[PDB]
Every structure is written in C-alpha cells, then in structure tokens.
Amino acid sequence: RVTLQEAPGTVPPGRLPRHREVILLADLVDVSKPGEEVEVTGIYKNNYDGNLNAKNGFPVFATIIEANSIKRREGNTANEGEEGLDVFSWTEEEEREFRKISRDRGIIDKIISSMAPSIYGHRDIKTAVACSLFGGVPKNVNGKHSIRGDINVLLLGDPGTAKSQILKYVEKTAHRAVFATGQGASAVGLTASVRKDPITKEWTLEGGALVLADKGVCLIDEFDKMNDQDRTSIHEAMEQQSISISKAGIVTTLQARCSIIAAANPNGGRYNSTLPLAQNVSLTEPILSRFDILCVVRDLVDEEADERLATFVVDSHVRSHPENLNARQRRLQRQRKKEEEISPIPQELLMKYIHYART
Amino acid sequence: KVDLAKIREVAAREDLYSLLARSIAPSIYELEDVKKGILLQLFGGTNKTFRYRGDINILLCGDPSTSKSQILQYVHKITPRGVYTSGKGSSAVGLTAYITRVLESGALVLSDGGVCCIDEFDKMSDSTRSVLHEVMEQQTISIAKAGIITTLNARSSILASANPIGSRYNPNLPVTENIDLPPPLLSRFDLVYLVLDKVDEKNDRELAKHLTNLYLEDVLPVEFLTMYISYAKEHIHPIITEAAKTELVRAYVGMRKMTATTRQLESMIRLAEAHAKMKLKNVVELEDVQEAVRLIRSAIKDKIDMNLVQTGKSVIQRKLQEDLSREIMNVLKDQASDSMSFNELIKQINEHSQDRVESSDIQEALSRLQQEDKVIVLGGVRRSV
Amino acid sequence: SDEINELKEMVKDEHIYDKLVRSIAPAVFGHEAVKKGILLQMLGGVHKSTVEGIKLRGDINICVVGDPSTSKSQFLKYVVGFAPRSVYTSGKASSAAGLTAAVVRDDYTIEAGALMLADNGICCIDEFDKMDISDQVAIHEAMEQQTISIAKAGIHATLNARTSILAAANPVGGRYNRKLSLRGNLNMTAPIMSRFDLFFVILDDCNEKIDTELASHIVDLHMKPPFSAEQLRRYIKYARTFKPILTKEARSYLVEKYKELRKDDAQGFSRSSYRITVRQLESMIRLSEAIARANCVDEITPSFIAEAYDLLRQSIIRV
Amino acid sequence: SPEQTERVFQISFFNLPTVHRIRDIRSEKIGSLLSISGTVTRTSEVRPELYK
DNA sequence: TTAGAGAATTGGAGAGTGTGTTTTTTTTTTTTTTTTT
DNA sequence: CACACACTCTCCAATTCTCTAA
Numbered sequence A: 001r002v003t004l005q006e007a008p009g010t011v012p013p014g015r016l017p018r019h020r021e022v023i024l025l026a027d028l029v030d031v032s033k034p035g036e037e038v039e040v041t042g043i044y045k046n047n048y049d050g051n052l053n054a055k056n057g058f059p060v061f062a063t064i065i066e067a068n069s070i071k072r073r074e075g076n077t078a079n080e081g082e083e084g085l086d087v088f089s090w091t092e093e094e095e096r097e098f099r100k101i102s103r104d105r106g107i108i109d110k111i112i113s114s115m116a117p118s119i120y121g122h123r124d125i126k127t128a129v130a131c132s133l134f135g136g137v138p139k140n141v142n143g144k145h146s147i148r149g150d151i152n153v154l155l156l157g158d159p160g161t162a163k164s165q166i167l168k169y170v171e172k173t174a175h176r177a178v179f180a181t182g183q184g185a186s187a188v189g190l191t192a193s194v195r196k197d198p199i200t201k202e203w204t205l206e207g208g209a210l211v212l213a214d215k216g217v218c219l220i221d222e223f224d225k226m227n228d229q230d231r232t233s234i235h236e237a238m239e240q241q242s243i244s245i246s247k248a249g250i251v252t253t254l255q256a257r258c259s260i261i262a263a264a265n266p267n268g269g270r271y272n273s274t275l276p277l278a279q280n281v282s283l284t285e286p287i288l289s290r291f292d293i294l295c296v297v298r299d300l301v302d303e304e305a306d307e308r309l310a311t312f313v314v315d316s317h318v319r320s321h322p323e324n325l326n327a328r329q330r331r332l333q334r335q336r337k338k339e340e341e342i343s344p345i346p347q348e349l350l351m352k353y354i355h356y357a358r359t
Numbered sequence B: 001k002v003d004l005a006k007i008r009e010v011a012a013r014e015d016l017y018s019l020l021a022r023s024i025a026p027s028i029y030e031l032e033d034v035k036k037g038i039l040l041q042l043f044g045g046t047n048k049t050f051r052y053r054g055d056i057n058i059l060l061c062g063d064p065s066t067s068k069s070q071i072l073q074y075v076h077k078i079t080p081r082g083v084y085t086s087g088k089g090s091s092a093v094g095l096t097a098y099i100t101r102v103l104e105s106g107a108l109v110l111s112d113g114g115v116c117c118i119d120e121f122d123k124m125s126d127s128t129r130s131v132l133h134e135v136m137e138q139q140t141i142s143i144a145k146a147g148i149i150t151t152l153n154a155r156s157s158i159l160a161s162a163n164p165i166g167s168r169y170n171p172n173l174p175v176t177e178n179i180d181l182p183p184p185l186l187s188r189f190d191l192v193y194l195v196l197d198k199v200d201e202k203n204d205r206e207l208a209k210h211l212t213n214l215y216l217e218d219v220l221p222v223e224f225l226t227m228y229i230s231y232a233k234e235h236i237h238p239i240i241t242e243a244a245k246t247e248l249v250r251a252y253v254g255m256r257k258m259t260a261t262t263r264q265l266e267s268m269i270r271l272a273e274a275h276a277k278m279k280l281k282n283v284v285e286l287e288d289v290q291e292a293v294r295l296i297r298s299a300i301k302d303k304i305d306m307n308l309v310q311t312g313k314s315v316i317q318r319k320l321q322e323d324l325s326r327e328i329m330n331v332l333k334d335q336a337s338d339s340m341s342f343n344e345l346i347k348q349i350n351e352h353s354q355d356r357v358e359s360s361d362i363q364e365a366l367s368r369l370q371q372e373d374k375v376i377v378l379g380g381v382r383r384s385v
Numbered sequence C: 001s002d003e004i005n006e007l008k009e010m011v012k013d014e015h016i017y018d019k020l021v022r023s024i025a026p027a028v029f030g031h032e033a034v035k036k037g038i039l040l041q042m043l044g045g046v047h048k049s050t051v052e053g054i055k056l057r058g059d060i061n062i063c064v065v066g067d068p069s070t071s072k073s074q075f076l077k078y079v080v081g082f083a084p085r086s087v088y089t090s091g092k093a094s095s096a097a098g099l100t101a102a103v104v105r106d107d108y109t110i111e112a113g114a115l116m117l118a119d120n121g122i123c124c125i126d127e128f129d130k131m132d133i134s135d136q137v138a139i140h141e142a143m144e145q146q147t148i149s150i151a152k153a154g155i156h157a158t159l160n161a162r163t164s165i166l167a168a169a170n171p172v173g174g175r176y177n178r179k180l181s182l183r184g185n186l187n188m189t190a191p192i193m194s195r196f197d198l199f200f201v202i203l204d205d206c207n208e209k210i211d212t213e214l215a216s217h218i219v220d221l222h223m224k225p226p227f228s229a230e231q232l233r234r235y236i237k238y239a240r241t242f243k244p245i246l247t248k249e250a251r252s253y254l255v256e257k258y259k260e261l262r263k264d265d266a267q268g269f270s271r272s273s274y275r276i277t278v279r280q281l282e283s284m285i286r287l288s289e290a291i292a293r294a295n296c297v298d299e300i301t302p303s304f305i306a307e308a309y310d311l312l313r314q315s316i317i318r319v
Numbered sequence D: 001s002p003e004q005t006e007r008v009f010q011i012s013f014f015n016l017p018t019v020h021r022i023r024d025i026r027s028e029k030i031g032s033l034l035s036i037s038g039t040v041t042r043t044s045e046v047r048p049e050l051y052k
Numbered sequence E: 001t002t003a004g005a006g007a008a009t010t011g012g013a014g015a016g017t018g019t020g021t022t023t024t025t026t027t028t029t030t031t032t033t034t035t036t037t
Numbered sequence F: 001c002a003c004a005c006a007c008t009c010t011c012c013a014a015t016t017c018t019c020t021a022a
C-alpha cells in the first residue's frame, strides 16, 4: 500500500490536503520513495467495510486506487514534449545522437553555453554548474579508503545576479534534486531524523534532503542565513557522503552522495573587494574548504556590459511572453524555434545527455 | 436562577456632567478630570457602516501607592459587558484567542462596545503588548490554523492602568520613558492621565479625614446611573454640526502651531460625540467641542516622543555620529591602522570625549553609519571606509 | 450587459488613467504618487516562464516609508478592504514561520503563513522596520522566486507564494532624516532593498494651508472619487486579462533608460552599485506592463517606459 | 452507446422565510425543512454512498 | 340442514447449536520546531 | 473454561378443513 496525498502546490492555501490509499502489486512495489511527487494511473475501486458504515452512520464505501502504472513528476512539468513513465530514459536513436554530439570539437563550451541559456554572462558560474551537474568519479582503494566524487559549488555574491535562478534551473535539469532555503532548512530536515509512530510507538528513520538527493544534487539558497546549528549538519555529507545517526537507540549510517550547490551573500549584503574572503563572509575554514569551486559575483557598473546584459534581458522577456501539423505537434516546432535561438543544444537532449553521462 | 421620566430627571440638569462624574465612583477622593473622561468612555462616540468607530481608549499612569486601581474596579462595576484583568495576567493567546481540541477566547474579545479593563499595563510582556495594534487600530483580529481561515471582531474600549518602573514617577522626565512603553501603542490611546499627586497637607488633611469618614455610622443614582448609561447607549447617536467643524479645525490648527498628530483630531471628533451623547443631545456643538479639547490639554499639556526620541537627545545622537567620524579619522592619521578594538573605542569615546555615553548608544550611531556605509564592522572589529 | 456598458463607458474615457489614481484610497488625502503605485500593484506585470524552465516575476512590490504619524497604514487598511486574496500582518507580531510556513506536530505537517494565505494577491506588512532581521530574511525567496521551499524533520516541501508585497515602514529614529538618501534612513540591506520594485517616502511637513486642507478632509470624512469601489474592482478584473507586448521602439528605448539609471548609482573606485541591479530593469518591464493594463492597451509605447522611469527616479534621487 | 442509467434529481429548495441557529435546533422539528446558519470547522473526504 | 367424526396443516415449545465477553490509555522519555524566551 | 443471547431445527398437539349420517 501507498498513502498518496495532494501536492502542496495544487492544494489551495489554508485548506486541508486530501489523500487516497493506492495499491501496488507485482513489479510495481518499491517504485516510489516517501516524499516524491508521483503521478499514478490506475483503477478507481470501492468496497464495503463496516467501520465506515459504523462511524459515519450512512451506507458509505471506502475507495482505493489499484495502481496500473507510476511516473515521477520530475522535469519542468508544464511541457507537452516529454512522454513515458521516465523522462530521463533514452531511446536507441537518442543514445546514437549523444555519441554523435560528444565528438563535436568544442562540445564542452557548447554544453557550458547551454547551462541556464536565458541567463546572460557568468560563464565561470555556468562552468562550475556544468562540472557539479556531471560530477567526478567516486573511488574506493583496496576496500580500505574512499574518496568523494561529487563537486560542491558556492555562488557567493551581490544581489540580483541570477544566483537563485541558476539554482532553480539546476532543480529542473538534474536527475534527483532537492531545494532548501535559509531559515526554512533544519539540521535534521537536511541529514536525517528519527520519527516515533503514534500506533506501534517505537522509533524509525525519516530521510532528509541529503538522502532524498542521494546520487543527485542538493541546492541550498541563502546558505549564509541558515542558523550555524543547522548549517553545520552538512559537514559529514560533504566529504564522507554519509549521515551517521545515533538517536533513540537507532545507531546506524545512511549514504548521502550528493553534490551540494549553495548560494550566499557577503557580510553587509554586498561584496567588498578590498577585504580578504574570510572577512567578506561569516563562514569558516572547515565549511569553506568543503566547497571545491567558489564563484565570486560582483555587480559592477559598466556602460557597455550593462547594454549587452540589458539587451539580452529585454529580448528574453519578449521571447518568453505567453502570447509570442496538428496542434500537439505544431506547438513543438515553435518551442524548438524559440529554444534554439538561445541554446547550442536542445534542453530535452541535454537532460538525457547528463543522466546518460552520469550513469 | 440564583421609565423614561427618570432619564428626564437627570437630562435637564445644570450640573449634569459634574453630577455623573461625582457619582460613577463616590468613594474615590477627587481625581475629578479622571472621572470626567471615564464617563465619556461609558457612553462612547458614534458608529457607521457602508473608517472609525465610537470606542474610546484611556490609560492611567502613576505610583502604585494610589486609588487608580480602585477606579478600574468601579468601571468594571458600572460598565455593560466588559472584563477585568492585568498585564502579567495570562499568555498573549489567553488575552486574544486560540484553537484547541474550536475557539478559545480571551479578555480582548467578546466585549463589543464594552470596557476591557486591564491593570499592570507597564509590566505586560512585549509579545503580549504586540497583540493590541490590530484591535486598537482596526477593531479586529486575524487567525489561520488547522483548516480554519478567520477574522474576529474585537471592538473593545480599553481602560488601561500602569505603574512607574521601580520608584516614584519623576515629573521632569517624560511619560514615554517612565512607563517603558512603545510610543505607537501609547499614541493609540485617546487619553493618557498622569494619576499623580505629591505629599500635600492641604489635600491630605482632607483625604485622610474623608477616607476615615466611612466608618462613622450604622446626590447618588447608585443603580440608575448604569441604567442611564445603558439607555443612553441604546438611544442616542450624535452628529457633527457645521458650527462644530469650524472649531475642530481651528483648535487642531492652534495645537499644530503650538505638537499635534492627526490622531489628536480623531480623538477630538470621537470625544466631542461622546460629550454630546452625554446630555443625550444627539447633535455635536461648539460647547461640547471645547470640553473635548480642554480634557486633551488637561491630559497631554497637564515632541510626542515617538521612537522614545526627544529633541534634546536626537541632537546628541547626531553629535555621537560626528564623534565617531572625527575619532576614527584622527586615529587613521596618527596610528598605524584604520581599525581599533571595541575596548579601545570605549577607551577613547567614554573616557574624555563627552559626558558618559554607554556602549549601546555607540552601537546605535555606528549601525546607522553602516546603513550610510562609512565604516565596516567585522565579527568586535571596526575599520574605516 | 448591464455591466458591459460601464466597462465600455470607462475604456472610452479621454483621461481614465487620472480617474483611476484618484479613485484609489479615497479616504486618504494627497499622496497621489502612492495612489499611482498602488493602482499599478493591483494590475501587476505579465508573469513569464522561459524556454529554459526559468520563471520570471510579474508581481510588483511597493515599500511606503515615512514619519510614524503620516497616514501609511491607511493604505494597508484600504488595500486589505479592496483587493481579493489579501492579508494584513505586521513586524513586531511577526516570525519567520508566521510569514512563510511553520511545521506542526502531534507526524509533522505544513501550517500556512501570511505569504501563502495571500498567494495570487497582496500581503500587507505593517511596522516593517520594527520586524526582527532574523524574521525579515525569511521572505527573500518568496519576494523574488515566488515560492517557499522547506526541509524539516520528515517534511521537505515546495509551496507557492505568488504574492505582491506592500510594506509600511518607520525610519530608525521616527523622523525621515532628510539629510540622507533613503538607503541610510531605514535598517534594510541591499538584498531586500533591491527586491522592492519602488519606494515612496511620505511626510507630514507642517504647513498651514496643507494642515487646514487635511483637517477639513478628516472632519468631512465624519459623515459630511470619480468611480465606485464596485466599478474600480470590475475595471481591474478586466484590465488584468490583457498581456501587453513590448514594441520594437519600446525595446530599444528601455535599454537606454536602464543605462541612465545604472550609470548614476555607481560608487567607489570599483564602480559598485547599491540600488540599481537588473531587478530594476525587470521592474521597468513590470511597471510599463501595468501602466499599459490601466490604459487597456495590448502594446507598450515608449511613453509608458518614461512613466515607469520617473516612478523609479522618484525612489532613488534623494541627496 | 451502452444503456445510460436513471437520472437522480437533487431538488434544492432555497430562500426560506426564516433562519435557525445551531442552538435553536430541537427534536420537535425532525423531518421538517429548515435553514441553518453556521461556520465550518471541518470537511470530510467526498465518499460514495451505496444509494440503490 | 345441523352436528359430529376423521384427515391435514400450522404454531411454538423446547431442544439444540454457536458466538462473544476482559479492557486500558496515563505516564515517562526522546525527539524536533516555534517562540517566547 | 461458562453463561447469556441469537438463531435454526424438529416434533407434537391444536385448530380448521372436509366428509358422513342423524
């Protein structure tokens, strides 16, 4: 059984989420993990049971969805071009297309230009995001010792510079990803926590953002504005890529092989270029050294770079305007037209190319 | 369990306003202007639907050593509806409202048009002070929890009472300081009375001889007053006359020339309605408006101290901003750094620069100078632009 | 058709844009540039989703600042009375989880906050400078990314907060210290100072002809506008259905007006800005779209960018 | 087409002369058409009654 | 045509079989989040 | 376990039906 509840972005605010019991049978069991947004197809059914009829006082029947398939609502979701139960699967005619483009002279600089293609400039951030989004290779040495393969990235800089838009793009683009923000993220909402059941009423583990992003990315917006007690929960999952709980007689270690991308502002809200880094930021050497690419963003005035940037932002609003051979195919030639003005490579191909290169 | 002609006996009278004042609380010695204003709070101003409302709000302030709490008792005895409580007397949600295993309701609610009496108001916790702005400014409360999304009408005339913090209230120093209470909540009261007197024989010879006068034996509408109030609140609904308008403006201009926020004009309008509802007059006139002023002048005159600021202290903050400017520039000239430890900042600024300024004022001026961006604070460390 | 004849009578009018800023907050005397801002906030810019899956904010954020006496909260009273999907809240009563969302137990779940309860409408925040900075920072995602995202106990989540913010503030010291640019009067830092689209300073500078006019309004307000609230509400619901387009002469004009804002804000040897970021370029787009919505026109003229640019200068220039 | 069922009709009376409070409810009025004014504290799932 | 003797069907005594019932539920520790400290 | 209730099974006699002679 799976209790399936309404998605909090479709649930109208201040009104309760509804749920249904879903039943998974042979070959559908173990397909979805607690906390995913899931889409089910199935048979809606009902049966008599006396407890309803007893407590409700009417001849009323419980209802159950016998599941016939499951899909996980990853990707951008406002998209007609992405059929099937797995949006990161490829076909043979797609793998052959990855092999073709992988031997384009300058494929790295095409892929980097295609990271957040509607964000102008910032090629060092796009470079750092590309590296973190593909990752390195994890290593184990005679069984005795292990080395971290994930690349962690800190976007440090001034306001209104697409640090948060770069992170919200990586949440659409990465295979498994989780997003968290400042005072909204706790030490054990990251990491993991122990739950007590109301019925059987003994202890169990609930996985946090660094488990639900395992073999994936965790995106930490406004990392400077976390509580230091919450921010210091990350130190094990950066290097050892594990979460070692010992609480309530549960003593164990979860795996937590995420890449972490973080976005922060300097002290006083602005970068001050005459100071050393350790004075521009409220962080310290053990957490600053766990990040293995640092990007500093300075929003300096310049009369020609601000023409090139303002031109790109104006054109990006006009191109993205919601009022700019059958319709379900015919919308895809205009979506393809608009996307290929900006990007060297289709976004649907780059999502599958990244998952293919990772796996 | 457990006639109209009588209104006319009172409503015709020459002495009427003073009669009612001397009979709402007949044990209480003098404090005549406190009685006179509380009386207008019982009737209240006027109301309309389609904003402002006929609720009135009063604060008493002064030493714990006096009968002002006994007034707060008489008002709870006289008033239709109403509740008596005090500042420390519950959690915030116990004074407003809460949700349970379903409405919990507190002293600030279920008293529409009724006097919410509160004592110890100076020592109410600040989280509980921060309950009142939606009630005192919009007559209403908002909540959303556990599927409930809701608003509740609070609609109470507050009668508050407060002590000085610690010792006797000093008369030189300001009312904002001496209660330790925030001006945007204080400015929200329609009247504030300093209920204070000195040791004074030519009063106290009378007061002691009055207080002991009660024990000697085996005009006062002792019930008919609360019924007179009830019938006045049922029947009488004043309106501004054109001959009232010219004075309400002229007096507000006089007070602005003299030092008067528009909250004073809103207080004058609602009091001049209550002073026409008293006398049952149903119409507001020059002779009513002039008492609404005279009561406010007797309250405030007896610059409005917002942000706990004073003219003779904001000039000091600007001199402290200049003191930081010069003190850091001369050290940048003579010493081998543009930065100094906060210990050496208190050991320039506090030791010989000026009369003794504590670290909290330095941190204020310096923070407002971070906002202007002329020094950088790091961690204990401070460095010139 | 009884209502369609009123919308026909409105859109035809030679001067409707003037009639709209005069019908806003009619109980408040003066402050006509704030009336104009509040109208534009209720119309909003067009929300846009990019071919890269990146979302762009359409909603406008207004900050009103001034003396603790000078009428600012009467706008918040008005807006929460007039506009659908709206809430009132304030700074001393605030918390990070009160504003955004909290986590409740006894299993964990979401309790909706002030910025979710106002999703697709206006969150009015009073006492804003008196809000604890540890609780102020909680809205930086909900102001710009228009979502609140959470990781606590067993309940990770992402929630909508497609809300316009209207914030009322007092200077640090009560009096707007006229010797200072806005950036120094107010305890806000560049991260949030750059989120608000435009700021209005409003004041009660004591002068007798103004004083007599204001007192005359407040006494006449006790039982003594070219459109009704029911008319203005129907006009707005109509205007909100347009999705204005930036014409080629407007696209090319907009880049030069942003350069002229951006050139002047530069400070120190590095030429760092403080107020002007590309959020202010996107603010000229949002404002010129709302200015077009009030005129009920589907296409943006460069004169609507000039009207947006003066609404941005009116926040910046104070010496 | 298949065969399509009997339609069930919800007759919805409205605009009664008088409104009762939850405290005005008395068993003497069982089986009689009232109108009731109140505020919702909870709502259940939408469930199927076995009707026929 | 009444009335009385013999045949058929129904009522219910009572014997037989089968099922459910005690019943509690605060207290005390451990945790994780909000806020009022 | 054992003792009440819920429910079915079976037999016996009580009543009414039907035919005959007084």
Ligand SMILES: Nc1ncnc2c1ncn2[C@@H]1O[C@H](COP(=O)(O)OP(=O)(O)NP(=O)(O)O)[C@@H](O)[C@H]1O
Pocket: A118, A119, A120, A121, A122, A158, A159, A160, A161, A162, A163, A164, A165, A166, A263, A264, A265, A309, A313, C056, C057, C140, C144, C145, C191, C278, C279, C282
């Ligand atoms: N280089 C850029 N190219 C295009 N658009 C940009 C660029 N920089 C910023 N923007 C846009 O302006 C807004 C600011 O980006 P955002 O990601 O919200 O700022 P940020 O860098 O995270 N600043 P902050 O939240 O204050 O720390 C978004 O709408 C972006 O789309």
Ligand SMILES: [Mg+2]
Pocket: A163, A164, A165
């Ligand atoms: Mg950001």
